[PDB]
Amino acid sequence: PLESQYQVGPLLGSGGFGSVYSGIRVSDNLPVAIKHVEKDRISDWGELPNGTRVPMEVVLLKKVSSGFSGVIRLLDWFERPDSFVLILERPEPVQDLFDFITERGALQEELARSFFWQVLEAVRHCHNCGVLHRDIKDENILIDLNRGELKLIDFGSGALLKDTVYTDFDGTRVYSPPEWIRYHRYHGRSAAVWSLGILLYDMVCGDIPFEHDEEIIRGQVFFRQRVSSECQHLIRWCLALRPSDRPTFEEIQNHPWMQDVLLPQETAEIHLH
Ligand SMILES: N[C@H]1CC[C@H](CN2c3ccccc3Oc3ccc(Cl)cc32)CC1
């Protein structure tokens, strides 16, 4: 019944994640995103609790989509003969963090603090649910412009969280940690923290800190914008070369730069209205 339940609108984007369209749920006019993925291009499968063969992406989304959170929720899904179709929440109006930064340049620290805090809360939620995102970056973060609320997208490179080593990685290279570059090995949480350091730098500097493998491995951070000593410190800690020298999520959120975070609505009033 997919074609009757949803009115399809314009294409929003396409890439390694498939093709995503704007949509409306006909039942109640709820704005949705409709994501199509060809079966040929799915290397990663799992099974539901009740147990049919689905993309791992659906497993992971189902695990994180219970209750409210800073993740774009899976509302429904459908199987077609050559594709899967996912129905996702769609905030309106919305802009991804990559475009937002591209247009406004480097973010004021107050705005970066609010945004970074919300990303931490969302990643914590994922980890709590037993999901590792593995591609945390500006283009996988949506901003609900009216509410000042950030939402994580794209679990297509994600995995079940585990305490043992990962030796596969399909995320974005320039957000990938030095242990991946050097050894093709990482642990979930510490690699996530590295990607968070890259993200935070991107927010306050308006560009990523490392372009080449050699710079990632060297791990020396140069600031191109005026950034507070406390923010520089947090970034440098997240980007520690040794995984065990990086902060835990608790330590990031208890860091002095992260004090007195604005609520999402206040952030929208001050910075987005
Ligand atoms: N850098 C990208 C360019 C394409 C869109 C695609 N998109 C999406 C892509 C992949 C997985 C889930 C997605 O979930 C969405 C939910 C809601 C909207 Cl409005 C959009 C998506 C977002 C920004």
Domains of the chain by start residue, with CATH: 1-92 (3.30.200.20), 93-273 (1.10.510.10)
- Of all protein residues, the one whose alpha carbon is nearest to atom 19 of ligand 1 is 90
Sequence-ordered list of residues with C-beta below 8 angstroms from that of 245, at least 6 positions apart, any chain = 237
Q: Are 52 and 132 in contact (CB under 8 A)?
A: no
- Of 44, 76, 135, 154, which residue is the catalytic one? 135
Rg (CA), the chain: 19
Is the CB of residue 97 below 6 angstroms from any atom belonging to ligand 1? Answer: no
The residue type found at 200 is: L
Is 14 known as a binding-site position?
Answer: yes
Q: Are 268 and 147 in contact (CB under 8 A)?
A: yes
**Experimentally determined by:** X-ray
Q: Which two tokens stand for residue 20?
A: 């995503």
> CA 100 to CA 174: how far, in whole Å?
19
Ramachandran region of residue 164, left (φ > 0), alpha (ψ -120 to 50) or beta?
beta
How many CB atoms lie under 10 A from the CB of residue 82?
9
Helical axes 188-205 vs 97-104, angle rounded to 10°: 30
Q: How many CA atoms lie within 13 A of 93 on its CB side?
A: 7
Sequence-ordered list of residues with C-beta below 8 angstroms from that of 193, at least 6 positions apart, any chain = 238, 246, 247, 248, 249, 252
Distance from Cα 13 to the centre of ligand 1, integer Å: 7
To the query of whether residue 135 is one of the catalytic residues in this protein, the response is yes
> CA 27 to CA 116: how far, in whole Å?
35
Q: Which two tokens stand for residue 132?
A: 């590792």
Instruction: Tell me the β-bridge partners of 47.
Output: 53
Sequence-ordered list of residues with C-beta below 8 angstroms from that of 174, at least 6 positions apart, any chain = 198, 208, 210, 211, 216
Resolution in units of Å: 1.9
Closest ligand 1 atom to 153 CA: 12
Place of tokens 């939402």: 151
DSSP string, the chain: -HHHHEEEEEEEEEETTEEEEEEEETTTTEEEEEEEEEGGG---EEE-SS--EEEHHHHHHHHH-SSS-SBPPEEEEEE-SSEEEEEEE--SSEEEHHHHHHHH-SPPHHHHHHHHHHHHHHHHHHHHTTEE-S--SGGGEEEETTTTEEEE---TT-EE--SSPB----S-GGGS-HHHHHHS-B-HHHHHHHHHHHHHHHHHHSS-S--SHHHHHH-----SS---HHHHHHHHHHT-SSGGGSPPHHHHHTSGGGSSPPPHHHHIIIII-
Q: Is 1 exposed, middle or buried (0-12, 13-18, 19+ CB in 10 A)?
A: exposed
Instruction: Tell me the β-bridge partners of 1.
Output: none
For strand 94-96 and strand 131-132, is the pairing parallel, antiparallel, or unpaired? unpaired
Distance from Cα 63 to the centre of ligand 1, integer Å: 19
